Amino acid sequence: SNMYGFGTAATGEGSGLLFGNPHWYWKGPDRFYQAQLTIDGEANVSGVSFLGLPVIQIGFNDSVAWSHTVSTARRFGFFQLSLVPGDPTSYLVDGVPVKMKPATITVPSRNADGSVSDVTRTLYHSEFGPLVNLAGLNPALAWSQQTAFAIRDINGENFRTLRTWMRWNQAKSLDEFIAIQKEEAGIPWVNTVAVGRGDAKAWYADIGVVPNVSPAQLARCTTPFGKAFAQALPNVPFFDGSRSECDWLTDADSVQPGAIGVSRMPSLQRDDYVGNMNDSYWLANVHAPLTGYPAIFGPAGTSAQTLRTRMGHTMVLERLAGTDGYPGNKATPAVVREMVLGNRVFSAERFKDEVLDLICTPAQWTVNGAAVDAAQACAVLAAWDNRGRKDSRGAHLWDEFWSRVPTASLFTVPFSAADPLNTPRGINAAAADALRQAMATAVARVGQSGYALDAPRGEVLYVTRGGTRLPLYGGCGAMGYFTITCSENDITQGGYSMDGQPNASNSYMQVVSFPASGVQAHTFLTYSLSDDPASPHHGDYTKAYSAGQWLRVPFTEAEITGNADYRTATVKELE
Amino acid sequence: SNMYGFGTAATGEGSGLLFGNPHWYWKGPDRFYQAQLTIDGEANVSGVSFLGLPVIQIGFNDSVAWSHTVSTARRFGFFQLSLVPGDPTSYLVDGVPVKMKPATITVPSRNADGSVSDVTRTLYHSEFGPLVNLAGLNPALAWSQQTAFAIRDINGENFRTLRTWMRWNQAKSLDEFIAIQKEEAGIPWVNTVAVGRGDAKAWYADIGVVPNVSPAQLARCTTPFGKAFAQALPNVPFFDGSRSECDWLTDADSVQPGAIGVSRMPSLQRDDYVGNMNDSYWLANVHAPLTGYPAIFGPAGTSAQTLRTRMGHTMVLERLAGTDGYPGNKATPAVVREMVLGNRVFSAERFKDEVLDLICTPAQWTVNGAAVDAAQACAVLAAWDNRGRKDSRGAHLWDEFWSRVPTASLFTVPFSAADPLNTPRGINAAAADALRQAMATAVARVGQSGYALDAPRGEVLYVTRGGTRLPLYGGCGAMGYFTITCSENDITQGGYSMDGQPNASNSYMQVVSFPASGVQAHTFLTYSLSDDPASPHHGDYTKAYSAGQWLRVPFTEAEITGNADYRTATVKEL
Amino acid sequence: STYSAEIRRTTMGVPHIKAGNWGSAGYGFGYVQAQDNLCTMADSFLTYRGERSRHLGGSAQLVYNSTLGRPRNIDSDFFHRHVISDEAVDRTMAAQPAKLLQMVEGFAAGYNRYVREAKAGGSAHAACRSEAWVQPITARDVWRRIYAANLAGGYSNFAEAIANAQPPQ
Amino acid sequence: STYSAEIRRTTMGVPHIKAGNWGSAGYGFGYVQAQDNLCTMADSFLTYRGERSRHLGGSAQLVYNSTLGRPRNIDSDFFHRHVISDEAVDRTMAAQPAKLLQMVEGFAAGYNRYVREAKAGGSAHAACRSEAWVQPITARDVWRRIYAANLAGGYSNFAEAIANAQPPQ
Numbered sequence A: 001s002n003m004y005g006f007g008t009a010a011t012g013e014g015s016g017l018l019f020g021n022p023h024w025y026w027k028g029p030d031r032f033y034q035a036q037l038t039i040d041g042e043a044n045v046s047g048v049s050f051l052g053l054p055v056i057q058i059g060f061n062d063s064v065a066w067s068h069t070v071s072t073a074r075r076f077g078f079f080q081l082s083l084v085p086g087d088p089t090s091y092l093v094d095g096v097p098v099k100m101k102p103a104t105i106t107v108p109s110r111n112a113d114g115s116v117s118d119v120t121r122t123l124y125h126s127e128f129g130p131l132v133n134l135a136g137l138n139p140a141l142a143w144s145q146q147t148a149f150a151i152r153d154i155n156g157e158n159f160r161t162l163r164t165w166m167r168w169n170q171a172k173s174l175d176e177f178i179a180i181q182k183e184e185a186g187i188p189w190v191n192t193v194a195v196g197r198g199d200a201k202a203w204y205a206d207i208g209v210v211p212n213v214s215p216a217q218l219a220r221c222t223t224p225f226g227k228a229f230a231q232a233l234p235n236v237p238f239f240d241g242s243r244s245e246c247d248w249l250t251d252a253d254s255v256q257p258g259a260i261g262v263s264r265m266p267s268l269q270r271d272d273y274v275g276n277m278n279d280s281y282w283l284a285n286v287h288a289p290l291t292g293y294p295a296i297f298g299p300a301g302t303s304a305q306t307l308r309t310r311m312g313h314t315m316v317l318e319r320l321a322g323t324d325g326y327p328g329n330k331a332t333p334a335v336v337r338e339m340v341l342g343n344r345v346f347s348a349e350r351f352k353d354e355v356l357d358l359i360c361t362p363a364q365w366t367v368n369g370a371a372v373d374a375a376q377a378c379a380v381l382a383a384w385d386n387r388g389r390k391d392s393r394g395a396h397l398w399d400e401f402w403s404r405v406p407t408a409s410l411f412t413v414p415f416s417a418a419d420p421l422n423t424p425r426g427i428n429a430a431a432a433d434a435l436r437q438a439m440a441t442a443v444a445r446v447g448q449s450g451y452a453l454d455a456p457r458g459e460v461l462y463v464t465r466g467g468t469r470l471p472l473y474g475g476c477g478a479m480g481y482f483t484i485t486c487s488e489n490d491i492t493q494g495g496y497s498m499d500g501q502p503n504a505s506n507s508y509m510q511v512v513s514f515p516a517s518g519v520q521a522h523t524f525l526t527y528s529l530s531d532d533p534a535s536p537h538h539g540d541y542t543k544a545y546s547a548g549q550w551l552r553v554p555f556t557e558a559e560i561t562g563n564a565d566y567r568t569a570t571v572k573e574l575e
Numbered sequence B: 001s002n003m004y005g006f007g008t009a010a011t012g013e014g015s016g017l018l019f020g021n022p023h024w025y026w027k028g029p030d031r032f033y034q035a036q037l038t039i040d041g042e043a044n045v046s047g048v049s050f051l052g053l054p055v056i057q058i059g060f061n062d063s064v065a066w067s068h069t070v071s072t073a074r075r076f077g078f079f080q081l082s083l084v085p086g087d088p089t090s091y092l093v094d095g096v097p098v099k100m101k102p103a104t105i106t107v108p109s110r111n112a113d114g115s116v117s118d119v120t121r122t123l124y125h126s127e128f129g130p131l132v133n134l135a136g137l138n139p140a141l142a143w144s145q146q147t148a149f150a151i152r153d154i155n156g157e158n159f160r161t162l163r164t165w166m167r168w169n170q171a172k173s174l175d176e177f178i179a180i181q182k183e184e185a186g187i188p189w190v191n192t193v194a195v196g197r198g199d200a201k202a203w204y205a206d207i208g209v210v211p212n213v214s215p216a217q218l219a220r221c222t223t224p225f226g227k228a229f230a231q232a233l234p235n236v237p238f239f240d241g242s243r244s245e246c247d248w249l250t251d252a253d254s255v256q257p258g259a260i261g262v263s264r265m266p267s268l269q270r271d272d273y274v275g276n277m278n279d280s281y282w283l284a285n286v287h288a289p290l291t292g293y294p295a296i297f298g299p300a301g302t303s304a305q306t307l308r309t310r311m312g313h314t315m316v317l318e319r320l321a322g323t324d325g326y327p328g329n330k331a332t333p334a335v336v337r338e339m340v341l342g343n344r345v346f347s348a349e350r351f352k353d354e355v356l357d358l359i360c361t362p363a364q365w366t367v368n369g370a371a372v373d374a375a376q377a378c379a380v381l382a383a384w385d386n387r388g389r390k391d392s393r394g395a396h397l398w399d400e401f402w403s404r405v406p407t408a409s410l411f412t413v414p415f416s417a418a419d420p421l422n423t424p425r426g427i428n429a430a431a432a433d434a435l436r437q438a439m440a441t442a443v444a445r446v447g448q449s450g451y452a453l454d455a456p457r458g459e460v461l462y463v464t465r466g467g468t469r470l471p472l473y474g475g476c477g478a479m480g481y482f483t484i485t486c487s488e489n490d491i492t493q494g495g496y497s498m499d500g501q502p503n504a505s506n507s508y509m510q511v512v513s514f515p516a517s518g519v520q521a522h523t524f525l526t527y528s529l530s531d532d533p534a535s536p537h538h539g540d541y542t543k544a545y546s547a548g549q550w551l552r553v554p555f556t557e558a559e560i561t562g563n564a565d566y567r568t569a570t571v572k573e574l
Numbered sequence C, D: 001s002t003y004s005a006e007i008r009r010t011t012m013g014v015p016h017i018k019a020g021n022w023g024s025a026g027y028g029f030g031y032v033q034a035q036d037n038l039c040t041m042a043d044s045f046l047t048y049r050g051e052r053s054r055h056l057g058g059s060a061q062l063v064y065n066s067t068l069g070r071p072r073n074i075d076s077d078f079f080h081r082h083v084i085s086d087e088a089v090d091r092t093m094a095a096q097p098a099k100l101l102q103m104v105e106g107f108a109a110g111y112n113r114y115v116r117e118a119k120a121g122g123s124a125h126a127a128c129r130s131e132a133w134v135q136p137i138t139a140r141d142v143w144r145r146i147y148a149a150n151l152a153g154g155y156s157n158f159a160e161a162i163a164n165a166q167p168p169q
């Protein structure tokens, strides 16, 4: 997921601009659904909600606009229980026995023969949360006579989320928006960026519900088993549940017990920009890095950024420097609408030439003792301009290649907190052989697929509507794409089809500004509103997305009634 | 898998006739490969082998012809181990502690980042076999500080399988073929049907390696846990590993310790016919049932036969009775070639009309509180002739229907050992609502597939070669097809495609007879010889199968060299 | 006494709900969501209620991928019943302002309205409209889905493991 | 050692191998099988040797469905190494007639022959010819595949279970 929040200094206009770009599901109950809610004397909000949710989670009103991205901040933790000898369903806390709360659950289950039989299991809760089976993770973690494990999710006791979004839906200023976010502190697992009418500075924050643990606890409460998972699940507290001193803390300004106080959770306001591409709060603004916040929020100057993060921030800097090839040097609605669909591929822009210089001469290789002709692969990549547009040729070859490149000791210039956008860098000459291996495999896979090496991406990357393949653009963020169209389908199985259940990809997209005339918003719903193939709203939005034609969505009553496709109907029934 | 063994009484000729029809994999190392081996003065055999096997497992020579089908006989067993307190890697046997045979194994595994890291696990063997984790089966059968579990497969010590196929390849008579089978008793997990040149009777046998346990053992040696899942694994010995009396027995004429003697393993010779469609030996021949043999071989009159088994036997009886719509009343090569590709559906033939009569008057329904229009579904299925040919219309609707019909008390006339081809039968009128529920879903599925209810089967069931979709016929056994073309692909995802990894389906097919001039074999290899798409032998066999054009495979030197596509080349190395 | 909402649709079928109060707003919103995505939603409520196996079988996977991944129905059913318990729903609902309670009750009623329309007839939602699992829901059913959305960063990722947390035999 | 085999192909590419002995018959047979199905076969020898993980990753499933089903590479590797041990191969081989051992020696040699041709060049088997798992095999490797075929009725069905059977913690 991406989001930008531009201030007046980057807009050159009287208001800032908000770009929302969640990469989410294209099918299932969690997919977004676009709608506007006009509640007389209460709210006039438009945006997107999960199917099944009654309030707008991402959108805008006449005064504010916001989006979300998944945060690196951990929202859960594990507790290792010391069991009472004789009773594996009781645990000890400071020497005092405590019984686990049991629940005998019976689930009716249909058999292959059409009959329905009952399956019964008894499951337990501790005072920390549900018991959890970590055996698959490591069989030494099995629920035994001595020890068991529970998991605690801070949101299990968080009931302030809908109320947060509802109040945002009603908010009449960014200041109110911010105040609400601090009062409720109920955002469960996402960052927030917001822009407000008549406000010069954009807003970023990872303010929400996050487990509260002290550096002391992290050192003296983490159990032998826990220290072994510090690699797989870093910053996930894995504490001893036999000691009350290892319980999650509450701060003076905590809204919820066990959660971090508002004032120890990161936020930032800026006249230029704020942004997140799913990395830590650290680089909300590259010019003004955030530091010193609890480690559970993620690294801030210690870990390299993803290629997508590097691409995201780069795009902004080059925009405001006027070196991105787009007109001017401001983040205008029109320019932003284009840049965000630019389909630039960080991996290629930065590393392709180095790769080709290392392996493409000679172009006749010996790989695994076999003759490989890579002349065509090299020529195609050399002629490719490092973009994943519909007319781009060879972009799929790079994909199949990069995803197979071993990352161990691949870069010779290590990460520097001083240069997070340009480090790590430097393709290692020692990786020559591994690269030819990856390139050889890549060429083979493309061969299996039936696609030429220089096939335009729009023929490989597509979605079907009305029996015709609509060409698509973009790619997966692992290759440094910003515009995300990430198929779960292997290229050998009919290309990068988006007709199945793709990986997190562009879904709802909004570019929202607040000119003098009022909120203006351009939107996409890539997969369209309806899941019913017969519906007229199954492929209409998709066709526009394929064509890169944003929709100026009506908001005012005059805009709605004046719309070319305006139809109204009243639904009523007894309550 | 299907196979027929026709005797001279059925052929009306000097020799019998063999139909081999394994339903097997269309991809992977277990898939069949057709070839002929001629080894000066030792063998001249033609047929099929798994990729990676150097002898012919299914085929024919100048004297014999055979095929296989998976057997119901259980080839494995479990041993509940009583551990030694303190050391759970040792078990008690008649009191005396026995050590488990350990083996620490390091497997190099490539990580997602491209690095290779070692993963090491310590696994164990017992005198019975390898330790097995049955916790996934039931959390109560976890390897504890008291009880563990081991599995034993009789084929684990069976080193005679290839030698058997090798000797068969060389066999000169059906009698030698039989003698080899009894002598080696090395067949691992399949049945066997064989036909011979100049021999009057066809041969069936479930003669191989099979665990030997006595009724006394079943009663004494079965453990508490064992009893608790003899309905999940019927007839699988789940014995106590504490008592030596609970170890598998050895008869006088047993070739392998722990295996059944050759005297108490089922076989039959007939001049009319033998056959198997993956049910027990019981109905090798329907006119002369086999009974009395041990339970581990499967039920012999206490369980209903599958729809496909009933379809297979029914086809033979109607052939010989001369009432299947084919010339004469004899199982000739030309007629068998058509009969086996008939695309008859037993469910439809027997139960369809009953279902429509019950649910299609009226055809405007109310299902789950919802109005359902089933008029077209009823009309299509009534017009359909209960066949799954390429031109057949509505067969896919039946498929989607029948597979969702609840079988519980669906039949009013229950199984009768005395009439096992025509029982069970009688669609219970009480299931009308359930049938409507199933049919409504089926129409909804077909609707979401983009195929019409009356779409010809050739367009729904297909295989892609060179960008062109070859139309196919047949179906899945569950529906009562004999000609098996069973997709694993859901119809909503582009129909019944066979381009993926389909369920067991028609693979190698052979119709072998022994005329005076010499062996004549007609064959199919459905998916073609080569898995390489750029190969000329990737889709050449497949096109023919689609068009239903059998191949007369050359056998004699003169036939090979006289073939229109004859090419020779020799390969040597020191 | 009554729910009433005007439903305006524009290009791409974007619905603009206008209502006089929160309950009616939920009514309209619930209606249009079902109208467009009935099959997905119907299937979804099976999940949160823990009623997947009864209809679709215990060993089959979730149809749709989500924050929950795609575990087996049986494990999913246990997870939801155990974690999204009647108690959890009680505590959730007890912390809500009246307007949101009303809005969710309206949402359910609106969703239920379309269910009646789909059952009665129409060529829409042919894929599921006549299935048993297309049925009326309750406000508590919606609240279950809302609670479920919260757990994406925690429990949801350990659904199978929570459903199979059993003491030694 | 000095293998010689005449390969006649007829309609549909059906090969008819002619050799003066069993060793040379295996040579011809192994060659044609590899010539037509190298990728599948090369992949299969990873399986029986327990070397899938090294090349294809441990978490990934078996590429092809078989009597072995499609477990995770890592579990399959452990299964094969454990059940199809060097001892298992030793005893399988110890009980073979001279001509079979010779036929398998030849089969390996014939397979390896085509491997060299595929590596050398050509457009055949473009999908795997340059991969590392396309490599020469030993007679024992073929015996592994032969033994593996016997277990389809037993062990094969409990591959994962056998590979994860570990004593109590």
Ligand SMILES: *C(=O)CCCCCCCCC
Binding pocket: A001, A002, A021, A022, A023, A024, A057, A058, A068, A069, A070, A188, A189, A190
């Ligand atoms: C990218 O990660 C998108 C953010 C996830 C969905 C946001 C909707 C709000 C639910 C907390």
Ligand SMILES: *C(=O)CCCCCCCCC
Binding pocket: B001, B002, B022, B023, B024, B057, B058, B068, B069, B070, B190, B278
């Ligand atoms: C049908 O049920 C399968 C029959 C063919 C399987 C393999 C045949 C060779 C025996 C190992």
